[PDB]
Design a protein around this ligand. Structure first.
Ligand SMILES: C[C@H]1CC[C@H](c2ccc3scnc3c2)N(C(=O)C(=O)Nc2cnc(N)c(C3CC3)c2)C1
Ligand SMILES: C[C@H]1CC[C@H](c2ccc3scnc3c2)N(C(=O)C(=O)Nc2cnc(N)c(C3CC3)c2)C1
Ligand SMILES: C[C@H]1CC[C@H](c2ccc3scnc3c2)N(C(=O)C(=O)Nc2cnc(N)c(C3CC3)c2)C1
Ligand SMILES: CSC[C@H]1O[C@@H](n2cnc3c(N)ncnc32)[C@H](O)[C@@H]1O
Ligand SMILES: CSC[C@H]1O[C@@H](n2cnc3c(N)ncnc32)[C@H](O)[C@@H]1O
Ligand SMILES: CSC[C@H]1O[C@@H](n2cnc3c(N)ncnc32)[C@H](O)[C@@H]1O
Ligand SMILES: [Cl-]
Ligand SMILES: [Cl-]
Ligand SMILES: [Cl-]
Ligand SMILES: [Cl-]
Ligand SMILES: [Cl-]
Ligand SMILES: [Cl-]
Ligand SMILES: [Cl-]
Ligand SMILES: [Cl-]
Ligand SMILES: [Cl-]
Ligand SMILES: [Cl-]
Ligand SMILES: [Cl-]
Lengths: 625, 302, 625, 322
C-alpha cells in the first residue's frame, strides 16, 4: 500500500499529535521545528537577546522517532531572497538556525519552499549548509505544479487573468526548481515535493516533471471532490496523475484541514490506498525488474570475460525468447528440407555461443517438432559452461550433440553448417561484438547457409533524466579520468525518465555478410524532432533482431516482445546537460570504431548546441576482441 | 563401469583384478572387477565378478588368493573377500582410521598384516585378522606418496612422501624409520619397488621422470636413468629370474628396462595416464597395463 | 552458538553429502571442486586433449547453495612453486582453472594451503586472478599453527628432532603467511584459516597470530581426547585457545574422519557448542561495543562542530562516569565549606560544556547529598543543546541554574567560580582541546578555585594489527593526499590487535595552570621494550584523569574504570609497517603543535628504524580552535 | 606498438660500432654458408626484419661486397613513414636488388624462404620490445637451415641503491591513475648517481631460431645477489648481451660493454618501498615474463632479506603491446 504522510502547521503538543496521526494511519509527519509565527531577531537589539527557550526540547521524542517519523518544515516567515537587506540577513541566520536544528535532531528530511523565480540566496545558504556539516540529511523542495499566481480566481477587476496561450509561462514553476537545482550543483540530497492544485495544467507541464527526483507528492484536502455517500474522492485526471506518481513510488503528503466533517480523517488516505490496491497488479516482467529500476550496471562482455553461472541462469529463465528461437529454427528446417527428403537429409546445425545449452535444447525441440533430422554442434569458449554442456551431453543428449570448447573465430570445423544459431546480442545489438564473431565463423557456413539471427538493428532515443544524470555523475572513481563515467554506456532498466523523440535506427548488421570489403565500423547521423521544452542528459538504446523471416525479438518499447526479460535498455550519457526548447531538433552523431584488439563507440551532439566527442580513442570504454 | 582405471593385478592362477574410480561427473565412486577371462577386460558384461564401492579407489592389492585390499578416498581401508565360488565380492571390513585420502597400500611378507600410506602424512600397520590398527607412525612432513613392503620380511618396508624423504623401516627398532637419501636435494620420489631376487636393493621414480636404482647397505645411487618425460607413477618387476622393470608415467608411455636401466621396449598405446601394470604368471612375456583412457592393453615383450 | 563448517576430501554425491552435513548441524561445507586425484595436463599431448567433462555440473546445487554453503578447495596435486619447470607451468594453469571455476560458481570462499617457505609463484598467480575478474571472492589461506616438519614423531633414527630452544624457528609458519600476505600487497580478500595440531606450541607462537585476519580455525578430529562416557573433548590448553578464537568470532572447520565410532558425528560440533554456550555471558560494556569492534571512526570535535542529539544521548547513558563526577563534586564541596558555614556559604559552580545537562543534575545531586548550597551556571556553546538546557531550566531546575549560551573562552561572567566542572576530554585526553578551553575559562575562576577534572594524562602503546592497518589503508579517498588516511587518528574499539609493550604516559595537563608562560605544545619521546617478534602498524591511545583527589576515570586497560562506555581508544596509524624483532626497543616521538587557529599532532618512529614524520603542519588532520 | 619518429631512427643510425659489428657478423655468415667455388652460382636470400630507414640494408650490402658473395635483399618494415625513406632509397640508389616490404613480419607471406634473417628489435632489457614474438612469427619463412642475426640474447639484472633515482621515480606520480603506478614500470635511463650492490647475473635468454615444439616465451627466474656492504635497495638495473653470429657480440653489461656504443641506455625496475640490506645478507629477487594474446609484461618481487609486493600484477601499470 501507499507510504503516506501528514502535513501540519499547528502542533500544540507533539506527542498527542504524533499519536493521533499514527492512529489515522499515516507513516510520518511534517511539522515545524519552531513555531511558524515565532519570528526571531539576530542582528538588532533588543529582540536580539530574547530569553529562551526558542522551541521544544528534543527529549519529547525518542531518537528513533526523530530519525524515522518527523519531517521538518522551514518557518514561513524566513525569506532569504527578500528585497530588503535587513530581512535578507536575518533570514539567512534563521534558515541556518532551523537547518542546523533539524540536523541536530537527525531528521530524515526537511522541507523548503520554492514560491518565486529568484531563490538564489536561499540556494547559497542551503548549499553552504550541505557542504559544512557531517550530517546525512535530505532536503525536499516544495514546488507547486501550478504557481499560485496562475491559479488565482479571476476576481480582480483591474488585473484579470490573461486567457492567452502561454506555452513556456505555464512551465515557469519547473524553471524555478531547475535554476535552484542548478545553483546547488545537482546535489543528490535535494529532491522535489511536488504540490498539486485543484486545476491541473496542460499535459506538457505535467510531463515537464518526468525524470525529476520526485520524493513526495503533496495533496491538499481542497482538491478532493465528494460522491453520493459523502466520501472524499478525486477527479479522473487527478486519478491519472496519482497513478503516474504511484509508478514513481513517491510518498504522498496530505495537507489542509478536514472539510468532509461527517467522515474521519483517515478517509482521504483510505482513498489513496483504494487507488493503490485497485491498480493493475504486477505482471512477471515488472515483478522481476521492480528492484532493478534506474540501477546502473556496466555492460557484460561475454567475449572478453567468462560469465558466471547465475548470469547464465538469468539468461535461461526467459521462455518467450527461446520459444521464438525454436519457432525460427522450425521454420528454417521446413524451408530447407522438403517432406520427401525428411529421412535422407540431416541438417547440420551449430550453436555458436551455447552457454549452458538452452539453444541446444531449443534446437532439439525444433527438430522433433518439425520432423527433420539434425546434427548438433555446441560451440562455447567459456570452459566453465563447457563443463555444464558436457555433463548434459554425457547424461542426456548423447552423441547427437558434439560439444566444441573453442572460439568460433578460431575453431576449424570438420564440416560446414546448414544453420548457425547465436544469441551474442547486447542491449545495443552489436555492443558485444556479435558481428565480429559471426564474421570469423562465416567460413564454416555452407554457401547457402542460414544465420539465426539474420539481421539486427540498434535504436537510439534522446531522453531527459536529471536523476540518472546524477547517478552517472556519482559514478566517479579514484585513479582515472574524473569524467570517465560519462564516456561509457550503462545497462539499466530506465524508469524515471522522459522520451524526447521517437527511437530511430542506428546501426544494422546482416548475417551472412557476403560483402568483399567487410567493414563493421559505422558513422550515423540522427535528427530527433523535439516538440517539448526539456534538458537532454543522454540517449537510450534498444535493439530489434530478425531471427528468421517474421520471427523477431525486440526491446524497442514500441515493438517490444511481450514479457521478455533478458535485456534491459542501454544508456549513453553526456558530460553536460543540453537545454532543448520546443520545436528544436536534437542532432546526434554516433561512431562504431575498431582496431585489431578493441571495439568502441564514440558519440556527440551537434544540435541545437555541440557537445564534446565522447570516448575518443576508446579512452573510457572499449570492448575487447 | 567407471572411466578411470586405477589398478590391475594378476592372481596366481592368471585371473585379472581391476580397480576403477570415477574422477568426473555426478558421482565420484569406485568399483572392483574380477575377470577370469583377461582378454574380455575392460567390458563389464563379460566379467567374472564385480562390485560398486562407496567411494573411489586409489590403490589396490591382493590378500593372497580370495582377498582384495582397497585404499579408499573416504580415508578408509577396506578388505573385500571373494565369495560364492568367486561370483560375489563382499565387504569383509571397512575401517575409517585415516583422516584423508589413503593413497597406497602394501601387503607384508606374512600376508596377515598390511601397511597403508595416506595424505594425512601418517603411515599405519594393519592386522588383517583382528581388523584393527597395530601402529600409527607420523614420520613424514607431507602426504605419503608410496609404501612398499619388503618381499620376505614383514617388519621391513619402504615409504616415500612429498617431503622428499625415502624411509627404510624396521619395526623391530624403537626408532623404526631410517632416512636413506641419494645425493642431497633430489626431486620428489613418487614410486617404489623392491627387487625380486637381489634383496637390500630397490628402485624409485621421481616427479621429473627419472628412475633410480639404489642399494640399502651401500646407500649410494649406483645408477639412474631419465626414462620418462613426466612423473613416474609406478614400477613393477617381472617374474623372470633376470627381472625386467616396467616403468609407468604420466607422459602416457610404458617402458621396460633391464638391470642397468636401458630402454628395451616402449609403448605409446595409451592416450591418457598409465596407472598400473602386471605381468602374467602363465606367460612371462605378456604385460598388462591399464590407464585413465579406459584401455586394457596387453604387450608382448622380446 | 558457533558458526561451524565441515571439511571433506571425499564427496561421492554432492547432494547426499551436503544434506548429511546439514543434518549433522554444520553451517557450511568445504569440498573439492575437481576430484583431488584427478590430475590434469595442459601443455603436453596426449593427455592434453582428455575428453571431458572435467568435473561435476553447476546445476547440481542452486545458486543460493553455491553462494552460501560451499567453500572450494584447491586440489592437493597443484604445486605452483615446484622446483620442476614442467610442474610449475602446469600447476599455474591448473590453479587458474580451479580459481576461475570457483568464481564461476560464486563461492563465498576458496581454500589454498601454505605448506612451505616459498609460495612466491602461488602468490603471483593468486594476485593476478584477484586483479583480473569482476568477482567478489574471498580466499582463505590454510596455515598450520605448527609446521608438520616440527610436529613429526621422533621415529627417524638418523634424523632426530632437535630438542633445542629455537625461538624464531617455532614461528616459521607465521612468516610463511607474512611473506605471502606481503607479496599480494595486503589484499583484503586474503585471510587465514589457522589449522591446529595435537601439540600446541609456545605461547609466543600463538600470540604471533594476534591482529591477523583469522576467518577460520581448523580442528582435526585427531586432537580430541576422550572422557569416561566416550564423548570427544579437548584438553585445557586447547580449550583456552578455543575461547581466544571464539572472541575473534572465527568460523570453526572440522576435518578428518570420526574416530569416536560409538557417538555421532555431531558430537565434535556439540562440544564446540558446549564450550561456546558455557562461557562468561556478555556484560553491558561488551554488549554495547560488540558491534563497534574494529570500526574506524573519525574523532569528534565538539568545539569545531555542534554534536547531534543522539551523540549526547550516547554520552548521557553512562552511569559510572556521572557517579564519579558526583562523588568528586561531593568531596570538593565538603572540603571547601565547613559544617558551621553550611547555610552562610553558597558555592558558585560552573559547568563548562554542559551539553543537555547531565553534569548539572549530577551537581544538584552532589549538593543535595553533601548538605551544602550551590549556585549553578550551565555554559554551553551548542545552541541546539542550549534549547534542551533551557527547557530543563524552565520546567524543573528553576532560577537556581543560570543557562549561559556562549563560548567559555569568550563569556564575561558576572562572578568568579568556586568550582568549574568539565568533560571536554577525548579518547586521547587533550585531543578535543580541553586545555585551551579551560585556559580561556581560567579568568573567572577564583584565586583558590578548583577545576574538575584537575589532571589528565594521555597514554600510548605500540600495537600490531594487519587487520586495522588494512582498514586504514582502505580509507583512501579521491580529491586528497593518497596517504592522508595514515596521517590522522581514529576512535575505534580495538579488538583484533596485539599490545607490543606496556602503555606509557604521553602528555599531561593540569587545571588550573597558574604558570606565567603558558604553552600547551608538547614534545615527548617514548621507548617501548618489545620482548616478541612482531610488525608495528600503529599506536593505541588511552587516557586517565583525576577529577578530584582520588576520584579518577580511566580508559587505560590496566586501570580502566569498570563498565564505563563513553570513550573508545584512539589509534594513530603509520604509513609503512615496521618489523620489530624480539629484544628491540620501539622508540616513538609525539608532538602536540598549534597556531592561532589549529591544533594537531605529529608523530614518528625513530627506532629500530625511522618512519616519516606523520601529519606535518597538520596537513592531514587538524583540530579547530 | 608505436611508429618511431624520424629523429629516433636518426639516433639509432648515428652509431658506427654497432653496425660495424652487424656487418662483420653478416660477412662471417656469408663466408660460412657459401663456399668459394659457389660464389657466383649461389646467391643468398637475406631479409632485414625491422629495417627502419635502412642502415642494416646498407650494412648487408657492404658485407656482401666485402665477402665477394651474391645476396638478394628484402627490407621488411611495418612503419610506413620509414617505408617512405626505404622506398626513396630503393628508387634512387639501391635498385631492384632490394625488395621493400611494408608489412608486419608476423603477417607477411613471403614468396621465398630466407637464408639469413637480420634484426635489431632488442631493447635495453633484450626482450622488452618483443623481439622473441616477432622472430617467432617470422620463423616460417626461414629456411630449414637458416640463420638469425642475432642468434642469442640474454638480459642481466643487478640490485642498485640510489635515493636520487628513487625520488625521481616517486616524483613521476600523475593524476588519473594508481598513485604508485610509477614504481610498477621500468624506465630507460643513463644510470649515473647510483651504487651497484652485486654483480649482474643473467635473467632471461632467447635463441633464434627456436625450433622447439612447445614454444613458450613466458619466464620465471629467481636470482640471489650476495651483498657485502650496508645499503638501501631502491631498484634493479637491467642490461643485455647478444650474440649476433659466433663470436660477434653486442653488450651494454658494464663488465663486457661494447666500447663506444651509444644506442642503448640501461633499464631500471624500481620498487615501491626501499629495502634495508645489511652487510653479508643476500638480496633475493624474482622476475616473471608474462603474456596473453594481446599484451606482454614483467612482474617482479624481492623475497630476501625482506619481502616486497609483487610489482605490476596483471600488467596493470605497464604492458607491452603485441
Ligand atoms: C536482465 C538484466 C540482468 C542480466 C544482464 C546483465 C547486464 C549487466 C550486468 S553487470 C553484472 N551483471 C549483469 C547482468 N542484463 C542485460 O540487459 C544483458 O546484458 N543481457 C544480455 C547480454 N548479453 C547477451 N548475449 C544476452 C543474450 C540473452 C543471452 C543478454 C540486465
Ligand atoms: C562511545 C563511542 C560512540 C561515541 C563516541 C564517538 C566517537 C566518534 C564518532 S564519529 C560519529 N560519532 C562518533 C561518536 N566515542 C568516543 O569514544 C568518544 O569520542 N567519546 C567522547 C568524546 N568527547 C567527549 N567530550 C566525551 C565526553 C564524555 C562526554 C566522550 C565512541
Ligand atoms: C640512446 C637513448 C635515446 C634513444 C633511446 C630512447 C629510449 C626511450 C625514449 S622515450 C623517447 N625517446 C626515447 C629514446 N634509448 C635507448 O636506450 C633505446 O631505447 N634504444 C633502443 C630501443 N629499441 C631498439 N630496437 C634499439 C635498436 C638499436 C635500434 C635501440 C636511450
Ligand atoms: C549467452 S551470452 C553469449 C555466449 O557466447 C559465448 N561466446 C561469445 N563469443 C564467443 C566466441 N567467439 N566463441 C565462442 N563462444 C563465444 C559467451 O561465452 C557466452 O556463453
Ligand atoms: C559533552 S561533549 C563537550 C561539550 O562541551 C561543549 N563545548 C566544547 N567547547 C566549548 C566551549 N569552548 N564553550 C562552550 N561549550 C563548549 C560542546 O559543545 C559539548 O557540548
Ligand atoms: C630499429 S627499431 C625496430 C624496428 O623494427 C620495426 N618493427 C618492429 N616490430 C616489427 C614487426 N613485427 N614487423 C615489422 N617491423 C617491425 C620497428 O617499426 C622499427 O623500425
Ligand atoms: Cl534524541
Ligand atoms: Cl574448466
Ligand atoms: Cl565509418
Ligand atoms: Cl559535453
Ligand atoms: Cl547456479
Ligand atoms: Cl537554536
Ligand atoms: Cl615543544
Ligand atoms: Cl613511514
Ligand atoms: Cl605513409
Ligand atoms: Cl613460467
Ligand atoms: Cl614493496
Amino acid at each position: 500500500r501507499v507510504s503516506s504522510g501528514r502535513d501540519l502547521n499547528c502542533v500544540p503538543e507533539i506527542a498527542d499529535t504524533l499519536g493521533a496521526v499514527a492512529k489515522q494511519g499515516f507513516d510520518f509527519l511534517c511539522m515545524p521545528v519552531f513555531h511558524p509565527r515565532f519570528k526571531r531577531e539576530f542582528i538588532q537589539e533588543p529582540a536580539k537577546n530574547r530569553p529562551g527557550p526558542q522551541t521544544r526540547s528534543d527529549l519529547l521524542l525518542s531518537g528513533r522517532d526523530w530519525n524515522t517519523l518527523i519531517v521538518g518544515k522551514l518557518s514561513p516567515w524566513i525569506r532569504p531572497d527578500s528585497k530588503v537587506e535587513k530581512i535578507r540577513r536575518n533570514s539567512e541566520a534563521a534558515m541556518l538556525q532551523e537547518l542546523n536544528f533539524g540536523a541536530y535532531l537527525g531528521l530524515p528530511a526537511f522541507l523548503l519552499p520554492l514560491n518565486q523565480e529568484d531563490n538564489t540566496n536561499l540556494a547559497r545558504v542551503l548549499t553552504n549548509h550541505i557542504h559544512t556539516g557531517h550530517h546525512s540529511s535530505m532536503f525536499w523542495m516544495r514546488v507547486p505544479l501550478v504557481a499560485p499566481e496562475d491559479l488565482r480566481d479571476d476576481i480582480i477587476e483591474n488585473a484579470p487573468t490573461t486567457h492567452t496561450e502561454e506555452y513556456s509561462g505555464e512551465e515557469k514553476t519547473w524553471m524555478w526548481w531547475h535554476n535552484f537545482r542548478t545553483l546547488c550543483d545537482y546535489s543528490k540530497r535535494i529532491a522535489v515535493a511536488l504540490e498539486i492544485g485543484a486545476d491541473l495544467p496542460s499535459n506538457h507541464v505535467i510531463d515537464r516533471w518526468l525524470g525529476e527526483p520526485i520524493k513526495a507528492a503533496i495533496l491538499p484536502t481542497s482538491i478532493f471532490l465528494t460522491n453520493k455517500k459523502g466520501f472524499p474522492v478525486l477527479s479522473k485526471m487527478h486519478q491519472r496523475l496519482i497513478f503516474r506518481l504511484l509508478k514513481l513510488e513517491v510518498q504522498f503528503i496530505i495537507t489542509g484541514t478536514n472539510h468532509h466533517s461527517e467522515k474521519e480523517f483517515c478517509s482521504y488516505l483510505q482513498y489513496l490506498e483504494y487507488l493503490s490496491q485497485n491498480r493493475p497488479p504486477p505482471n512477471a516482467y515488472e515483478l522481476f525488474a521492480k528492484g532493478y529500476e534506474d540501477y546502473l550496471q556496466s555492460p557484460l562482455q561475454p567475449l572478453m570475460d567468462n560469465l558466471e553461472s547465475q548470469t547464465y541462469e538469468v539468461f535461461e529463465k526467459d521462455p518467450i525468447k527461446y520459444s521464438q528461437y525454436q519457432q525460427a529454427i522450425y521454420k528454417c528446417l521446413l524451408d530447407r528440407v522438403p517432406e520427401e527428403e525428411k529421412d535422407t537429409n540431416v541438417q547440420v546445425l551449430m550453436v555458436l555461443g551455447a552457454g549452458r545449452g538452452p539453444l541446444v535444447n531449443a534446437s532439439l525441440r525444433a527438430a522433433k517438432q518439425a520432423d527433420r533430422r539434425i546434427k548438433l554442434y555446441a560451440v562455447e569458449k567459456n570452459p566453465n559452461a563447457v563443463v555444464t554442456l558436457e555433463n548434459w551431453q554425457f547424461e542426456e543428449w548423447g552423441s547427437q550433440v558434439t560439444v566444441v570448447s573453442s572460439d568460433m573465430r578460431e575453431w576449424v570445423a570438420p564440416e560446414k553448417a546448414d544453420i548457425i544459431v547465436s544469441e551474442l546480442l547486447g542491449s545495443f545489438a552489436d555492443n558485444e561484438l556479435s558481428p565480429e564473431c559471426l564474421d570469423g565463423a562465416q567460413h564454416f557456413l555452407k554457401d547457402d547457409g542460414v544465420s539465426i539471427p539474420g539481421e539486427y538493428t540498434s535504436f537510439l532515443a534522446p531522453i531527459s533524466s536529471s536523476k540518472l544524470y546524477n547517478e552517472v555523475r556519482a559514478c566517479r572513481e579514484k585513479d582515472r579520468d574524473p569524467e570517465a563515467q560519462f564516456e561509457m554506456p550503462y545497462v539499466v532498466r530506465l524508469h524515471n525518465f522522459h522520451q524526447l523523440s521517437a527511437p530511430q535506427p542506428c546501426f544494422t548488421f546482416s548475417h551472412p555478410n557476403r560483402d568483399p570489403m567487410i567493414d563493421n565500423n559505422r558513422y550515423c547521423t540522427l535528427e530527433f524532432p523535439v516538440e517539448v521544452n526539456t534538458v537532454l542528459h543522454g540517449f537510450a538504446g534498444y535493439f530489434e533482431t530478425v531471427l528468421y523471416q517474421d520471427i523477431t525479438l525486440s526491446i524497442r518499447p514500441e515493438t517490444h516482445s511481450p514479457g521478455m526479460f533478458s535485456w534491459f535498455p542501454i544508456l549513453f550519457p553526456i558530460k553536460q546537460p543540453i537545454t532543448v526548447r520546443e520545436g528544436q531538433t536534437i542532432c546526434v552523431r554516433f561512431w562504431r570504431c575498431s582496431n585489431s584488439k578493441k571495439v568502441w563507440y564514440e558519440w556527440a551532439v551537434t544540435a541545437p548546441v555541440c557537445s564534446a566527442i565522447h570516448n575518443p580513442t576508446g579512452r573510457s570504454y572499449t570492448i575487447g576482441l | 563401469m567407471e572411466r578411470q582405471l586405477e589398478a590391475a593385478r594378476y592372481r596366481s592362477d592368471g585371473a585379472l583384478l581391476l580397480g576403477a574410480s570415477s574422477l568426473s561427473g555426478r558421482c565420484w565412486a569406485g568399483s572392483l572387477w574380477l575377470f577370469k577371462d583377461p582378454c574380455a577386460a575392460p567390458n563389464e558384461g563379460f566379467c567374472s565378478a564385480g562390485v560398486q564401492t562407496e567411494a573411489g579407489v586409489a590403490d589396490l592389492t591382493w590378500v593372497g588368493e580370495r582377498g582384495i585390499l582397497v585404499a579408499s578416498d573416504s580415508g578408509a581401508v577396506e578388505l573385500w573377500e571373494l565369495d560364492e565360488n568367486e561370483t560375489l565380492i563382499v565387504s569383509k571390513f571397512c575401517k575409517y582410521e585415516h583422516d584423508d585420502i589413503v593413497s597406497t597400500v602394501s601387503v607384508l611378507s606374512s600376508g596377515t598384516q598390511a601397511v597403508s600410506g595416506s595424505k594425512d602424512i601418517c603411515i599405519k600397520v594393519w592386522d588383517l585378522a583382528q581388523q584393527v590398527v597395530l601402529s600409527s607412525y607420523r614420520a613424514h612432513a607431507a602426504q605419503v606418496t608410496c609404501v612398499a613392503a619388503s618381499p620376505h620380511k614383514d617388519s621391513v618396508f619402504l615409504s616415500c612422501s612429498e617431503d622428499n624423504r625415502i624411509l627404510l623401516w624396521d619395526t623391530r627398532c624403537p626408532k623404526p624409520a631410517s632416512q636413506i637419501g641419494c645425493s642431497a636435494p633430489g626431486y620428489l620420489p613418487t614410486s617404489l619397488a623392491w627387487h625380486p631376487q637381489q634383496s637390500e636393493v630397490f628402485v624409485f621414480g621421481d616427479e621429473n621422470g627419472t628412475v633410480s636404482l639404489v642399494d640399502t647397505k651401500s646407500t649410494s645411487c649406483v645408477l639412474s636413468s631419465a626414462v620418462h618425460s613426466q612423473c613416474v607413477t609406478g614400477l613393477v618387476f617381472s617374474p623372470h629370474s633376470v627381472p625386467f622393470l616396467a616403468s609407468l608415467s604420466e607422459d602416457c608411455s610404458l617402458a621396460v628396462l633391464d638391470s642397468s636401466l636401458s630402454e628395451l621396449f616402449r609403448s605409446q598405446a595409451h592416450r591418457d595416464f598409465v596407472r598400473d601394470a602386471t605381468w602374467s604368471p602363465l606367460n612371462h612375456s605378456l604385460l598388462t597395463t591399464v590407464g585413465w583412457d579406459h584401455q586394457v592393453v596387453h604387450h608382448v615383450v622380446p
